[PDB]
DNA sequence: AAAAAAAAAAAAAAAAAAAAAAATTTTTTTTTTTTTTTTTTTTTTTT
């Protein structure tokens, strides 16, 4: 209920979701060398719950 | 001195050579970017 109450609401487990994070990970492309950010629950739910 | 004939001048039309003009997208390559994979190496877990 909190996740579908909050403005903004992430339900995530410990372990993160399916094929989620519970904390961003940042990597570098190979090929294009940016800095590809993979937002967890934590990044993902930022200013809210 | 004038008229008739001859010849010349001017002008216009036609032809030949030579310089000018017009027309003129498709096909193949290949580089970059992206993804895939094989091995090495590093980290984590277990005893």
Same mark, same amino acid.
């Given at each position: 209920?909190?996740?579908?109450? &909050? /403005?903004? $609401?992430?339900?995530?487990? $410990?372990?993160?979701?399916? !094929?989620?994070? #519970?904390? !961003? &990970?940042?990597? +570098?492309? /190979?090929? &294009? +060398?940016n800095?590809?950010?993979? $937002?967890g !629950?934590?990044? #993902? !739910?930022? $200013?809210?719950?």
């Open positions: 209920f909190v996740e579908k109450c &909050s /403005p903004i $609401g992430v339900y995530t487990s $410990g372990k993160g979701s399916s !094929a989620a994070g #519970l904390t !961003a &990970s940042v990597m +570098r492309d /190979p090929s &294009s +060398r800095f590809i950010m993979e $937002g !629950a934590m990044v #993902l !739910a930022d $200013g809210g719950v």
